[PDB]
Every structure is written in C-alpha cells, then in structure tokens.
Amino acid sequence: DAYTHDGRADGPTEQDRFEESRALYQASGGLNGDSFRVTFCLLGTEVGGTHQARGRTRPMFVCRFERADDVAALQDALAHGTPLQPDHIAATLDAEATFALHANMILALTVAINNASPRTGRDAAAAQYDQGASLRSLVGRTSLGQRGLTTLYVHHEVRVLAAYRRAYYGSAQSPFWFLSKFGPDEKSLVLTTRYYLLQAQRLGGAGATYDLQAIKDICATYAIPHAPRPDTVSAASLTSFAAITRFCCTSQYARGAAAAGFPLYVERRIAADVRETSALEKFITHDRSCLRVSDREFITYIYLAHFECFSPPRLATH
Amino acid sequence: LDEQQLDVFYCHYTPGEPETTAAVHTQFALLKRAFLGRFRILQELFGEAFEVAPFSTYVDNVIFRGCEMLTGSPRGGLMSVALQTDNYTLMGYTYARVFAFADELRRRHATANVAELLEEAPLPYVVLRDQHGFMSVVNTNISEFVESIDSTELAMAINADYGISSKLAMTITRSQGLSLDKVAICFTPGNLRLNSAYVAMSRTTSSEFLRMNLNPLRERHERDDVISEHILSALRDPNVVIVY
Amino acid sequence: AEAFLNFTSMHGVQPILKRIRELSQQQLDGAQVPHLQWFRDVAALESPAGLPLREFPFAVYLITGNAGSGKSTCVQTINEVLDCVVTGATRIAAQNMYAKLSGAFLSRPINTIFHEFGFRGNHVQAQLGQYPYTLTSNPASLEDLQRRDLTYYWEVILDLTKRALAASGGEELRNEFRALAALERTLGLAEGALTRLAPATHGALPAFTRSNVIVIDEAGLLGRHLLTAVVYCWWMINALYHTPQYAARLRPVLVCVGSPTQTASLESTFEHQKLRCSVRQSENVLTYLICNRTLREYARLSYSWAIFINNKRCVEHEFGNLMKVLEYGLPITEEHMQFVDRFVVPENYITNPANLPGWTRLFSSHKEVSAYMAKLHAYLKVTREGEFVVFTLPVLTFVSVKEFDEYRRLTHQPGLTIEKWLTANASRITNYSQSQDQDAGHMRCEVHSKQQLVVARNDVTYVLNSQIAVTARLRKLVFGFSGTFRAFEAVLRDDSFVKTQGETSVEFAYRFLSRLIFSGLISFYNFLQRPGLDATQRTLAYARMGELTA
Amino acid sequence: RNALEHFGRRETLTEVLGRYNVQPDAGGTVEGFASELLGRIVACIETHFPEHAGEYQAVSVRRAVSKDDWVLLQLVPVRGTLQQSLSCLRFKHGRASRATARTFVALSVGANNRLCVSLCQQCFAAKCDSNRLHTLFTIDAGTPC
DNA sequence: ATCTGTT
Numbered sequence A: 001d002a003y004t005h006d007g008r009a010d011g012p013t014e015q016d017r018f019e020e021s022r023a024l025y026q027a028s029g030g031l032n033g034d035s036f037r038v039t040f041c042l043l044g045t046e047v048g049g050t051h052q053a054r055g056r057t058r059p060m061f062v063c064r065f066e067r068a069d070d071v072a073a074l075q076d077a078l079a080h081g082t083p084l085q086p087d088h089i090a091a092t093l094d095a096e097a098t099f100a101l102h103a104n105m106i107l108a109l110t111v112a113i114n115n116a117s118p119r120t121g122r123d124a125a126a127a128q129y130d131q132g133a134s135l136r137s138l139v140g141r142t143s144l145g146q147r148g149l150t151t152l153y154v155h156h157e158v159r160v161l162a163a164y165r166r167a168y169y170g171s172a173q174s175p176f177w178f179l180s181k182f183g184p185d186e187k188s189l190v191l192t193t194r195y196y197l198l199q200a201q202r203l204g205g206a207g208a209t210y211d212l213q214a215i216k217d218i219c220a221t222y223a224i225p226h227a228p229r230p231d232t233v234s235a236a237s238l239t240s241f242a243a244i245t246r247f248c249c250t251s252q253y254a255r256g257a258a259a260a261g262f263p264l265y266v267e268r269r270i271a272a273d274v275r276e277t278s279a280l281e282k283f284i285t286h287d288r289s290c291l292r293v294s295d296r297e298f299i300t301y302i303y304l305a306h307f308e309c310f311s312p313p314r315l316a317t318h
Numbered sequence B: 001l002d003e004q005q006l007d008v009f010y011c012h013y014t015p016g017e018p019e020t021t022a023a024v025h026t027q028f029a030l031l032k033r034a035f036l037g038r039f040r041i042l043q044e045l046f047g048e049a050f051e052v053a054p055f056s057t058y059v060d061n062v063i064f065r066g067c068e069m070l071t072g073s074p075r076g077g078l079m080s081v082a083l084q085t086d087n088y089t090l091m092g093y094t095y096a097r098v099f100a101f102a103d104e105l106r107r108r109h110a111t112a113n114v115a116e117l118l119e120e121a122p123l124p125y126v127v128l129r130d131q132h133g134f135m136s137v138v139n140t141n142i143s144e145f146v147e148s149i150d151s152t153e154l155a156m157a158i159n160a161d162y163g164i165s166s167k168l169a170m171t172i173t174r175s176q177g178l179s180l181d182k183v184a185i186c187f188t189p190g191n192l193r194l195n196s197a198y199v200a201m202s203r204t205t206s207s208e209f210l211r212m213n214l215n216p217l218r219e220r221h222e223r224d225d226v227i228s229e230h231i232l233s234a235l236r237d238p239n240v241v242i243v244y
Numbered sequence C: 001a002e003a004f005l006n007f008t009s010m011h012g013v014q015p016i017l018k019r020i021r022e023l024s025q026q027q028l029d030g031a032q033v034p035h036l037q038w039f040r041d042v043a044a045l046e047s048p049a050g051l052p053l054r055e056f057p058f059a060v061y062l063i064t065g066n067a068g069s070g071k072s073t074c075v076q077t078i079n080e081v082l083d084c085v086v087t088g089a090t091r092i093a094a095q096n097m098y099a100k101l102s103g104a105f106l107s108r109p110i111n112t113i114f115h116e117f118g119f120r121g122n123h124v125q126a127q128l129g130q131y132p133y134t135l136t137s138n139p140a141s142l143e144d145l146q147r148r149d150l151t152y153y154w155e156v157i158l159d160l161t162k163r164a165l166a167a168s169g170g171e172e173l174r175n176e177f178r179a180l181a182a183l184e185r186t187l188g189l190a191e192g193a194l195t196r197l198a199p200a201t202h203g204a205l206p207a208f209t210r211s212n213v214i215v216i217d218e219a220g221l222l223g224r225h226l227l228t229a230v231v232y233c234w235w236m237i238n239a240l241y242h243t244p245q246y247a248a249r250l251r252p253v254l255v256c257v258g259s260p261t262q263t264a265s266l267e268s269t270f271e272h273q274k275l276r277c278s279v280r281q282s283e284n285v286l287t288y289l290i291c292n293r294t295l296r297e298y299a300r301l302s303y304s305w306a307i308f309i310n311n312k313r314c315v316e317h318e319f320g321n322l323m324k325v326l327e328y329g330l331p332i333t334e335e336h337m338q339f340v341d342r343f344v345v346p347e348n349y350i351t352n353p354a355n356l357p358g359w360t361r362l363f364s365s366h367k368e369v370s371a372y373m374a375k376l377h378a379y380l381k382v383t384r385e386g387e388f389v390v391f392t393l394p395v396l397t398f399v400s401v402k403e404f405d406e407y408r409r410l411t412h413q414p415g416l417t418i419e420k421w422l423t424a425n426a427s428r429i430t431n432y433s434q435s436q437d438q439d440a441g442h443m444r445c446e447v448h449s450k451q452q453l454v455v456a457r458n459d460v461t462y463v464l465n466s467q468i469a470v471t472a473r474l475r476k477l478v479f480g481f482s483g484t485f486r487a488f489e490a491v492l493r494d495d496s497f498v499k500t501q502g503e504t505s506v507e508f509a510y511r512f513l514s515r516l517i518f519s520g521l522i523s524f525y526n527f528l529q530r531p532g533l534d535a536t537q538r539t540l541a542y543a544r545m546g547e548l549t550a
Numbered sequence D: 001r002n003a004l005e006h007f008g009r010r011e012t013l014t015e016v017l018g019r020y021n022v023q024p025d026a027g028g029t030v031e032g033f034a035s036e037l038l039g040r041i042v043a044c045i046e047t048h049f050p051e052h053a054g055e056y057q058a059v060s061v062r063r064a065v066s067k068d069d070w071v072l073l074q075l076v077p078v079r080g081t082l083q084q085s086l087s088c089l090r091f092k093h094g095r096a097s098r099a100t101a102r103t104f105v106a107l108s109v110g111a112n113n114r115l116c117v118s119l120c121q122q123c124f125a126a127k128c129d130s131n132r133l134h135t136l137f138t139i140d141a142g143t144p145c
Numbered sequence E: 001a002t003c004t005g006t007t
C-alpha cells in the first residue's frame, strides 16, 4: 500500500482523498513517483505499544529506491510480480533506519546469552569489577548495528533464529494459508488482504477493530464491476509464492478507482450499519427495562423484538 | 497375463537414502511428480475404477490375520499424539515391539519394576486408522495411583490399559461436554430431575433422532430454578448486553 | 448466504470489546498490589489456620448462553483484536477452541487452565476439604471468601507456592526481567523498552507473565475454589518475576465463557473407613459470580455481563419453544407434554442392540452402561448378520506390597483383600471415567514373589472396525496408509499434513512419506487384474507406463 | 402470525383425521378408527410387554377427552376377560390387586402432519402416582394415509 | 447417578 505524507491540517474530504489516492495508484501498475521508501513487513505484533487494536504486521527492514535502475526494478516487482533479487535489496538498504528496529533485540539477546550467573567478585590484585559494572561494560562494548547482529548470528545462530521466530509469530505461512484465509475470490484475496493486514492499522478508522470475517463480509457488498481475466491460480502451483504474487499484482483490483475506494467504503458501510443497529438496540433496551408482565410474556417479547429487527427479509433489504 | 505383469518401472528407479534438507526436498519433489504421473496415466487409462481401487502402503512388511497385525519390526515413521476430538477406527492389535514407546516408558516412569515386568510379558498395541486413512500404533495407558493419607504419599498401584472408549453408550453426565447425532435416552423413574432431561434432550441438532423410554414432563421430577431466576432478572437489566 | 448470518453478531460484540479493554487497563494503587512477601509467608506455613485476611484484586467479564449460541464465536474477535490468553476447563474444550481460533486467522497452542497455574501430576491425588472454615461475617468480605477458597485448596496451593519460590534458585531473584530492567535504567531508555522482549528471548516463561486478560472456556465445569487459584497464581508468578505488567500496577481480568444451565461441577471424596467413594454437586465458577452478593457487587457484574440468546442447532419451531421453556424455567403446560410424547418408546425397545443401530444410549448409571455394553457384544457374536468380529485384550494392575503394608499399617484393617480394595478403588486408579463403562470379565488376583508385587489381570472386549475415541494423551507412530488411490492423492497434494506435525520432523515427515511413496508402488497390475478389464488397454497401459518411466 | 408466516402452516387434528376418513364428531366415527388401530396397539403390547397381553384380547373403546388438538379414548375390557381391570404395564406391584390402571389411546398430530397414536395409563398405586397420566409408547398410524 | 485436571 502506497501513501504520501499529509502536511495539511484538515484531512481532505472523502472525495478529495479518493482523488489523491486514485492518481497515486496508476491504472497500469506503476505508482506515480520519482523516489520511493519501502518498508518490508512480516506478520507479527509489536510489543510495548498501546492502541485500540493490536497490530498485525511488523517491519523488518527499510529500503530507498531513487536511482533509475532501482526504481525500474521496484516498478517491475510491483506491476508484474517478479521477485526482487538480493543484490538490489543489499544496494538500496537503508542501514540507519533498518537497524533502529533491531536495536533493543540485540541488547536483549546479548543479556540473555551473557545472563549466566555472574559473581563480579574475583578481587585478587586487579580482578574486582562492580556488581553493575559488568553489564554496563557489556552494553558499552556492544554495537547496535550490523556488527552486533552479524556476531550474534555467526556465534549463536540457533538462539538468534529461535528468538526472531517468536517476535514475528506466524511469519512463515504457505501460499495455501493465504489463499484460504483471504481468498478464494480474486477481489477478496486482493482487497481484504491489503486492508486487513496493512491499511487497517495505518488508517485507524472504525474498521480497525473488526476481524477478518467482518472485513470479508463488507467486501462482499463492494459490488464493483468485473472483467474476466484469461486464467486463475491453481493447485500444484501453491508450492511457491510466484504464481499467487503474479496473480495478485496484475489484478484490476490492485490499481485505480477499485483500489482507491475500498478503505472509504469500509467506513461508509460500517457507519451506515451502526446507524440502524444502535437505534434498534436502544429501542429494545428501553422496552426491556420497563415491561411489567411475566416470564413467559417477557421471553416472548424478547424473541419477537429481535425477530422483528433482524429477520432474514429485513437483513436482505438492508 | 501379458509379458508386462510386474510394473517393470521398478527395475529402473532406485531411490537412495535421504540427506540434508536440500537432498530431502529434491527426493520428495521428484517422487511426488512420479506418483501423480502414474496416477494420471492409470486414471486416463481407466478413469473412475482406478480412483476407487483398494490400496495400501506400509513402510515394513505387515500381515493382517483376523483381528491382528503381523510385522517384523516397526522402525521409522513420525511420532505424534492422539487427540480427543478426533475420530478413529479400531483395526486390530499387534505384538510388534516399538523401541520408542518402550524407551519413553523407561524415561518418564521412574518405576523400572513395571518397565521390566511389562518387558518380560508385553501387552499388545492397538492399531488405529484415522479419518484420512493412516495406520497408527498407540502406546499403552499407564497411570500411577498415589494415595495421600495425612499428607503421606505412596504410589501403591499402577494400571495398564489402552485408553480408548466408544460412543455407543455413556452416562448422561459425560454427555454434557459432547455433541451427538442420534440419542436414545433411558431415564430412571423416580431418580429424575428436570435438568438432566434438558441436558440429554439438547445433545443433537434435530428432534427426528431423539428417543426416550418415558415422558419426563409427565412424571414426578425435581426442579431447581435458582439459576434461571438470576438469568431472567439479568434480561431486565438495562446494563446487560443481549446479543442474538 | 453467509453474510447476513454474521450481521447481528459482528455489530454487537463491539460494546463487549470496549468494556473488556477498558477493564484491562485500570491501574491499582501501590498499597493494594500483592507483595512477594505475601507468598513467602504462605510458603512458611504448615496449616491454613494461620492465613491472614488478604485480598487479591481481580476483575471479570461474563459471557453466558446456551450451547448453540455464538458465545464462542465472540472469542475469535477477542483473540484477533486483544492480547489475551485463551484456555480451557478440560482438554476437549482446549482442542475445540484451537480448531475455531486457528481456523479463522491464527492462534498459538491452547492449553487448559490447570497447565497455566502450575497444576502437575501429583496434585491429582490431593484430598480437598479437610480443614474446617467458618465465615466470620454475615456479609462476608472478599478476603473472607478468598481465604475460605485458599483453605479448601490448601494441599495444592501450598505445593504450588513451594515449587514456585523454591525453583527460583532458592533466594536468587529471577533474572529474566530484572536483568533487562537494570540495563534499561543504565542505558536511559523508555520504560518497558527492553523488559517486554523477555518473552521472545526466553521461550520457557509462563503465559501468565505476558498478559492480564485470561479467557477460560466452559467455566461451568470448574469448582468455585478455582477462581481464587487462578487469581492467586497470577499474582504469585508476576510478583516472583516482577514482570512489566506487575510494575504497571495492573490486575488480572478473567473473561468467563460458559453455559450456567447445561453444565455443572462435581465433587468427590474418598472415605477410608468403608472404602467408599462419594460424589456430590458443588458450586461452579459461573454460579459463584451470579449468585454471591459479595462477588456480584465487587465485580459490578451488571456492567460486565453479556448474554447470547440464539441457537444455531435448532431450526424447528415446536422444539425450540420447548428448549426455551426448559432454560428459563417457565411453567410447563399441557401442549408441551403432548409434544414430548412423540419420542417415547418401550424401555425394552431402547435396550436392545438389534434396534436403532448406530445410536448412542444415554443412561444415568455406570452399571447400566456396562450392562448394555455386554449385551451388545454378545449379540455381535451369535447373529453375525454383518459379522463385526469381537475380540478381547489383556489388562494388568500391579499392586505394590510394601506400600499396601504402609497404607494398611497407617489405617489398620489387616485383611483388606486386594480384590476388595481394587473393587472399591475401581473409580480412582483409572485415568479416564469410561473405565467403568467397559465390558470386562471375571476378576482374578495372583501374588508374584521375589519382585514382591501383586498382579491383577482382566480382559476387555472390543469390536473390530468400530469407531472409538482415545480418552488420554498417548503418542502414536504411523507406519502406513490404507484406503483408495483418490484418498492418497489428496494427502500428498496438500502440505497441511506436514503443517499439522510439529516444526521439528518436517524432514522426517518428508522422509517418511518419501519412504512410503517408494514402497507404495507395485500392485497397480493387481488392480489391473480386475475381472473383464480389457485386452488392448492393458498393453496400452504398459506402453504408457514405460513411456512415463522413460 | 410471524411464526405462521415464517415456519409454514401446520395441519390441525380435524384435517388429519379426515384424511383417514374419520371425523371426531358423532362419537362412533372416531371409535371406529380406534378399533381399526387397536390391532397394532395390541401387537406392540404383546411384543414388548408379553406378560400383560391376555388383558387386551377383547377390549371396547370409549371416549374420554375431545379437545381441538388432542383426543383421548379409554380401553374398557368389554365385559368378560377373566381379570376384572387392567394391570400396570410399567411396574409389578404387590400382586393380588390389579393396581387399577385405566388404559387410554391418545391421538394427536405429529411431524409432517401425521397421526400419532400413543398408549397412556393411569395407575392408582402410590408408587406410580395416580392423578397422573403416563405414556408407555408411541406408534405411527400414517401407513393408511 | 454422576467428571475432570497430569500426559
């Protein structure tokens, strides 16, 4: 998901932001821009942050594409689905921003590895260091950059891998998991994936506290026009991510007005549904607390009121 | 029969033992390709008859005699744990010795006496086929009964069993944590409560698969409506959330 | 469709999430937070008669409903939106939740509530309810109810405290969180920057040290003494480690999900005089919260309560009206009794294995279940209308003779024939409750000298090709596959088989499947030997098979 | 009204009885149908309660209740059957007295607008209850639609 | 009458 920094105070009207986003998602596949700053994220939840809903993805590194060849490679990756080779990521990687994320992790891993019971009491002639001086020196001598991570990986690879596999829980899932959770429809597989995983937490509207089933239900009534494509994805190809990445990147729901108006529709639909649900619930609760009858009549009223509010025909009309 | 009667393909392919993940992945991918291709050719050659043909596959030599399985030595095959929400089918029993089950019995259970006595006279293992069709051998059930009298503890007895049960009949109490499909209830006239009938009547999805030996509503039953009044009075509370 | 069946549920669980999140963020005062010295005092105790009156803060949210409601579909939204710990009263409840949670987005392995507060295998034999307690208050306070529950559960409570404190290197304060906090202070970092990474670097810490919202499913099967055990163990494990949430002055929030009408708690005691087992009905966790006046006003249960009033497993009009009458305790009328007469049949009709084949017979006693089971097995032999072979398997119980002397010495009763002791304890030595529903033969006892044991053996009758359940956690080693070709193809195409296995035998699983695939060949021509198959097709298959082989 | 429009219309007892060429009015119209059905009732009683079978070899029918959705007829042992009254089918009381147990046939409408015939009993022994009607079994009479 | 925690 691509965006630009606002700068302005009052967030543009819904149509203004729709227009701004529609021109960013060019109708051919390539975003409009000369320089890009791409944060690569895996699944997982960050720790120590307080928000309405917990996070779904977690950044791992940051790259900047500004050169013509780098920008061309990124556009090819975003438009068709061709993988990015490690050379480009190593050349465009932003070290300062990348290693600010893996800053406290190195310290925690160093403390855990070095946490063997200390004594700091050898005394002798010149063998007496302070109780807290040992950890102070260890942290002072630890480089919170590529050096420290490289050393930890070289010497303690198993521990580092185990620790990193727990900060990014669920980061290793197969193509079938993605197809089943967010699919099987193309529109769902694209829009719901992008919203639930990436845009819901960044935008932080009223739809950031709705689960994946609710988001798929909302996407069901996003009944924008279709345009049959030649062929779809199939099994025996889900052993790799290449086929699904090509299928999703080259979709018509990934650019233009289709991809520019789903986040807006989510909020519109949620507000419209709540507008009716709240009023009906208020009516039901007011009548619930003042009805003076009997248990049989009270149960009759409860179920009759809920049927009158939410019988299948009324839900279909709504 | 014709000259080609034994699937000569074997005379040309020799799969060696596995190696590091790279070697293992290469072997599995090629074998899966070969297996599907033969399936495609035979399916193309015949069609549905090949699809529903009886089939089997085992790592070692296994012979099923009556209710028993005969095998040389069960070695290899991934270990796992049997679930409680799973449905299995009892295929038979076996006397083939498994080192993994025996060695752990030595490990987890500090009682070597039971380990040696069981080793001298071993008990058969139960062979189960899961829903998908994988034969499994399940370890025995050993429980240690330690009695606490005045905080004095003593593991006096051990019980070795199989730990399997059948859904053909149970008590009404054990059915309150279960979901059933067809239920036939046998109430006792006189030792009857209105809440035992509510629990037994609601184990199924439809009333077309429900039978009872008497009408619990027409007989003398015990009623305890203490919780029901609390639930009913919460439905009149403006602060309680009611969700349909 | 599937979009309007979740409309009423997805817009109504939002008020629930707002309250639960608000409850989980409330901060205590420094004087109310239980101190690590509280649990050191308990660990230095011999009888529960010296317990001081102390209060352990906590909060609750109730989510109740019938067994067909979507009250467990409300935990899939709490799990995806909130950071909580989902548990189960039993092992089946923990496995049903994982299927629902893992089948929606994702979930970690789900355990029982006994595994999370440290319940081990030696606590399954403790005798509960010995020491007497009297509530010295007409409107009993929380400290009075909490100390009553700590005295009933004293045998397990004392053991858990001793293991927790003793296992901490003795006096050595646990360094998992203290080491990072000291480094955090020295380096001048934001509070909680490093201490919240301890769970990742240390992968053996309990789940009670990572969150304060605890979700228990099927809380109606739990005794009322278990509300304090969870609250007393959450504070013990956080005070011991000094976790980031303990230092923030937060309290545990227990979200209790269950059905208060179709589920009950059971309490059983052993009398060593008549060698008798007594079972009575006790108060469960849900009834404790809803009925007790002190607990109901302390927890403000009128604001922390949600009721689900749907039933997805009832699409029949007249049957749904009978379930509503039974749940809410409405008067029974004559039109309800007329409706129920459809399902009545003679008792001899139900207790006849030849009738209603494949149905589950529900009895009230264990002797009736055993009596019918024997009849079924006998009928499955003689008639042979469909075969269904029946076989018997051996079972052995090894009774130690020195311990029996110790037990016999402590409680006299010299004779105490091992047969009579084993008969009386039949409901205790076993691991599962269905041991008494089995079809077993005559009981025989013998004495084995030298090794100094008493071995008792019996036989149990089973049916081949029948549907059984494994009522225990037993490891199984697979060695083959048995079915049709279409069944085999489906398993290999999807890697979900490998995923179900742990992330340590994937190479082993691939090797095992690779080994099975190689030996799974042949027999294609035995299938080709089917009567009247073909003449030219057989040769075409050979040529095609060779072509594919080449 | 909502239940009628949602779950569908249900047939009353009069229409179901008419489908069997029987009318609840006139008294004898339903007695004839009960007599035609009595063979199946007696066969079931013999099959499941063989001990209490001679009591139902010559039994006359007599109406007891004629509500809109429930009909209850009595089974009177004509005039000569050896045993004076009928005996309880559920328990074996202290022999001697027959523990007077009035026997009834109850007609109602079951699922799919079918006719349900149930056997009911009233026992005057304190153990059973008296003042209470007990259902022994229910059978289907929908074979002759 | 009567279940379940370990595993």
Ligand SMILES: Cc1cccc(C)c1N(CC(=O)Nc1ccc(-c2ncon2)cc1)C(=O)C1CCS(=O)(=O)CC1
Residues within 6 Å of the ligand: A303, A304, A306, A307, A308, A310, A311, A312, B244, C066, C309, C310, C311, C314, C320, C321, C323, C324, C327, D002, D003, D006
């Ligand atoms: C209430 C409702 C709302 C919307 C749509 C429908 C379909 C309904 N239902 C279905 C329903 O209530 N099912 C149910 C069955 C059992 C239990 C139960 N089990 C144990 O305890 N409770 C609880 C709910 C009705 O039945 C209406 C039908 C028309 S009406 O007559 O105007 C009101 C009831």
Ligand SMILES: [Zn+2]
Residues within 6 Å of the ligand: D088, D089, D090, D091, D093, D099, D101, D123, D124, D125, D128
């Ligand atoms: Zn009687």
